[PDB]
Amino acid sequence: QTRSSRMAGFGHAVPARCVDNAEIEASLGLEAGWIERRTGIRSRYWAEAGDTLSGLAERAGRMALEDAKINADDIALTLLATSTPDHLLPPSAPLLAHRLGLTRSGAIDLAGASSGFLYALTLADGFVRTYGRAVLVVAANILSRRINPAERASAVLFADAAGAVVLTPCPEVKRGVLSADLVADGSGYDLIQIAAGGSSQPFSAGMIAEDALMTMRDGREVFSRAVALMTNTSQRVLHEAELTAADISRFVPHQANARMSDAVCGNLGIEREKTVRTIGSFGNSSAATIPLSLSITNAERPLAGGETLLLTAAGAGMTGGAVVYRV
Amino acid sequence: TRSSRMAGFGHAVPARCVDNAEIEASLGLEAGWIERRTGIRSRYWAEAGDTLSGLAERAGRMALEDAKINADDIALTLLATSTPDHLLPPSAPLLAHRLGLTRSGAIDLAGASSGFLYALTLADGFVRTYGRAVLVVAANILSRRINPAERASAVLFADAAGAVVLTPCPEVKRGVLSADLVADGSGYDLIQIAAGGSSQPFSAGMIAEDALMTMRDGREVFSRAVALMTNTSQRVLHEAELTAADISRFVPHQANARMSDAVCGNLGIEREKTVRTIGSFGNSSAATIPLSLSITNAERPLAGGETLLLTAAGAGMTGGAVVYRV
Ligand SMILES: CC(C)(COP(=O)(O)OP(=O)(O)OC[C@H]1O[C@@H](n2cnc3c(N)ncnc32)[C@H](O)[C@@H]1OP(=O)(O)O)[C@@H](O)C(=O)NCCC(=O)NCCSC(=O)CCCC(=O)O
Numbered sequence: 343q344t345r346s347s348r349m350a351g352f353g354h355a356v357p358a359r360c361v362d363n364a365e366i367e368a369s370l371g372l373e374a375g376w377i378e379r380r381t382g383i384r385s386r387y388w389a390e391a392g393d394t395l396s397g398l399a400e401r402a403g404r405m406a407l408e409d410a411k412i413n414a415d416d417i418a419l420t421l422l423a424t425s426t427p428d429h430l431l432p433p434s435a436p437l438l439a440h441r442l443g444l445t446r447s448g449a450i451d452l453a454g455a456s457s458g459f460l461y462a463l464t465l466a467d468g469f470v471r472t473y474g475r476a477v478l479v480v481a482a483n484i485l486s487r488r489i490n491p492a493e494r495a496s497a498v499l500f501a502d503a504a505g506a507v508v509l510t511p512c513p514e515v516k517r518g519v520l521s522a523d524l525v526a527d528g529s530g531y532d533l534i535q536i537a538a539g540g541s542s543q544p545f546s547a548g549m550i551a552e553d554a555l556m557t558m559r560d561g562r563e564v565f566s567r568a569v570a571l572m573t574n575t576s577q578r579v580l581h582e583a584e585l586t587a588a589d590i591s592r593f594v595p596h597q598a599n600a601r602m603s604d605a606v607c608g609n610l611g612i613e614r615e616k617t618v619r620t621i622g623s624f625g626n627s628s629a630a631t632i633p634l635s636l637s638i639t640n641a642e643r644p645l646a647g648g649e650t651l652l653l654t655a656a657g658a659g660m661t662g663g664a665v666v667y668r669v
Numbered sequence: 670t671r672s673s674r675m676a677g678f679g680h681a682v683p684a685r686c687v688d689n690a691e692i693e694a695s696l697g698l699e700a701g702w703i704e705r706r707t708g709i710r711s712r713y714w715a716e717a718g719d720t721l722s723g724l725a726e727r728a729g730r731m732a733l734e735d736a737k738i739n740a741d742d743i744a745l746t747l748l749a750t751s752t753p754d755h756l757l758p759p760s761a762p763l764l765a766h767r768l769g770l771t772r773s774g775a776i777d778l779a780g781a782s783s784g785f786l787y788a789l790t791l792a793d794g795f796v797r798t799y800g801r802a803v804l805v806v807a808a809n810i811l812s813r814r815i816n817p818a819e820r821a822s823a824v825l826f827a828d829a830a831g832a833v834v835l836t837p838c839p840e841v842k843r844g845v846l847s848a849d850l851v852a853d854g855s856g857y858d859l860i861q862i863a864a865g866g867s868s869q870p871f872s873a874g875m876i877a878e879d880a881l882m883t884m885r886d887g888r889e890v891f892s893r894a895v896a897l898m899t900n901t902s903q904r905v906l907h908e909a910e911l912t913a914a915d916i917s918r919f920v921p922h923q924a925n926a927r928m929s930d931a932v933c934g935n936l937g938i939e940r941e942k943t944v945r946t947i948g949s950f951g952n953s954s955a956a957t958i959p960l961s962l963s964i965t966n967a968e969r970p971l972a973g974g975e976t977l978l979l980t981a982a983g984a985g986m987t988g989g990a991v992v993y994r995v
């Protein structure tokens with residue numbers, strides 16, 4: 343009897359340390375306002391000693407569970423979209439479920455870089471509709487511990503955060519996920535990467551510190567590919583939901599870079615004014631950006647029935663996706 | 670579309686065959702020690718230059734060809750792995766790229782030894798929701814994470830990939846009849862790698878050993894995993910309104926032969942209905958079930974009406990079971 347899913351609850355969490363552009367600009371020897379003019383970021387949050395990825399996910403998730411007024415037994419599945427799990431084994435999701443007291447919930451990690459959340463949303467929707475039970479979806483990242491401070495292009499963008507949504511089963515049609523498009527382009531696999539620690543170059547004694555840290559090979563190629571991926575996926579989910587950009591109530595792009603948000607907005611003819619923008623205070627926390635923005639915009643103005651959200655993201659991989667969601 | 674079908678099966682291993690004798694000699698063991706305690710006889714390990722995505726690609730490609738499916742037809746690739754090529758990006762986009770799946774999304778799932786059952790459950794949900802084919806690969810190179818001095822893990826773990834092509838099917842009362850996915854984080858520390866994640870990032874001056882698996886209490890892991898596989902199996906059987914006697918083939922995760930026997934015993938299922946690949950292929954985490962599916966399908970093609978009981982437990986703790994009807 344389940345025909346759709348609903349975003350029944352929202353949440354987000356950051357570590358407490360607020361890092362202004364001025365601190366980073368000092369470390370990298372750039373004049374004042376460099377970061378804000380080129381990225382739209384004004385400050386970001388970075389994790390501190392003691393802060394764990396699963397604990398950050400836990401705070402966002404608890405906020406979303408309480409927002410939904412859902413009992414913790416009712417969560418059948420927890421999807422944790424992250425690139426930065428506590429350990430390389432086991433995944434962080436079973437610990438997140440445990441910390442939240444979700445005793446009947448399965449749990450698994452999804453690694454889809456900055457696109458991870460949209461994949462998890464899509465797969466969760468298919469679970470809710472197939473099984474008629476609720477799913478908790480958390481995206482969270484502590485990228486700060488992966489930042490190469492000497493690499494200006496990445497050290498100025500990436501941030502730590504978590505966002506969470508509780509999806510519940512709904513009997514009605516023509517609502518929920520109207521369309522979804524998940525893409526990949528592995529020719530760009532090498533554009534955003536960590537060299538060491540996977541199976542191709544396991545972490546070894548005496549490795550170059552920087553080999554454990556993120557690198558962005560071609561910031562301009564990455565910009566072009568990501569804009570194309572977000573535009574093209576957005577475009578086809580709009581057509582499949584039979585909506586136009588003028589019909590979207592809120593546009594929630596991945597918060598990669600304000601200039602990319604602008605590029606996609608322009609390409610689709612979507613007002614900036616309908617576009618949720620959280621990069622100014624929260625930076626680029628990869629897969630976490632879209633659910634943190636959803637929590638923020640819902641906090642500002644509760645999502646009203648009939649509103650349409652366009653969610654889109656692109657990330658390392660390359661990966662990309664878009665979702666048309668009707669409240 | 671009302672169901673999914675496993676339209677193709679595939680598996681792959683690296684080229685280095687490792688007999689028990691070599692691991693027993695390294696560890697100062699008596700002959701037959703590994704086989705007595707695990708039922709493993711030999712395992713495949715990666716060689717230098719082998720990559721997880723390449724291994725996954727060989728299994729995936731065998732499954733795509735087995736499905737007689739146009740590469741254009743794959744809308745989504747799910748890669749269940751614990752051992753991606755790199756910590757960033759995920760390996761799934763590279764895997765999809767080398768297989769020529771130009772219309773496929775791609776993402777890694779990390780569910781330890783349960784990953785394939787989560788992937789299958791989530792892929793089946795996708796197929797039935799969107800009416801498009803999904804490629805599900807599970808692959809691991811655990812050999813590069815084995816602490817060779819730790820007997821409990823060095824004698825078990827192995828490298829493999831297995832793949833299943835799931836295609837949309839119009840008819841009801843077949844395919845995935847029921848699925849049950851569980852987690853128990855109170856056992857999270859039992860199977861762990863200390864360094865490398867965000868809790869203890871890998872740094873200059875680290876042990877390197879700290880980058881490798883440790884099993885802190887094999888006996889406790891054993892008990893918890895037998896319980897999780899048993900309970901999930903019972904509940905998928907109840908939901909599918911089947912008894913164990915109705916199951917044509919039982920395909921548990923190949924962790925350890927004593928564990929396959931204990932799970933069989935709890936569920937009342939005969940060893941003769943149980944697929945057992947651990948003797949030649951070892952414990953390759955989430956890869957075991959699809960590798961075994963490919964093997965058993967090679968021995969005897971899956972016939973319509975046959976019912977498969979799939980079940981696994983792993984680090985997390987995680988677990989799951991699936992009832993599938995051909
Ligand atoms: C916006 C720009 C044009 C520049 O922004 P920026 O970061 O401030 O870059 P920048 O390099 O400091 O600016 C220099 C840029 O200005 C130009 N330039 C200036 N001087 C030169 C020169 N000597 N030779 C050649 N080009 C030069 C080039 O366009 C430079 O770009 P580049 O060096 O290639 O980054 C772009 O290059 C860029 O960096 N875009 C953002 C990349 C991005 O958004 N990455 C994140 C995607 S999401 C993801 O998945 C998250 C992490 C993974 C995960 O864990 O999931």
Ligand SMILES: CC(C)(COP(=O)(O)OP(=O)(O)OC[C@H]1O[C@@H](n2cnc3c(N)ncnc32)[C@H](O)[C@@H]1OP(=O)(O)O)[C@@H](O)C(=O)NCCC(=O)NCCSC(=O)CCCC(=O)O
Nearest residue numbers: 706751781782821886887888890891924925927954983984
């Ligand atoms: C049947 C066995 C015994 C298996 O045998 P084994 O593991 O190869 O061997 P072992 O446990 O080392 O057996 C030897 C046992 O002899 C004991 N022993 C010997 N001398 C002493 C002493 N002086 N004092 C105290 N204990 C002593 C040891 O403690 C050993 O027991 P233990 O390690 O506690 O099981 C079972 O009890 C067991 O250990 N099971 C757990 C292994 C398992 O099932 N693993 C797979 C889970 S799947 C998964 O998710 C994969 C991980 C990675 C990934 O998914 O990515």
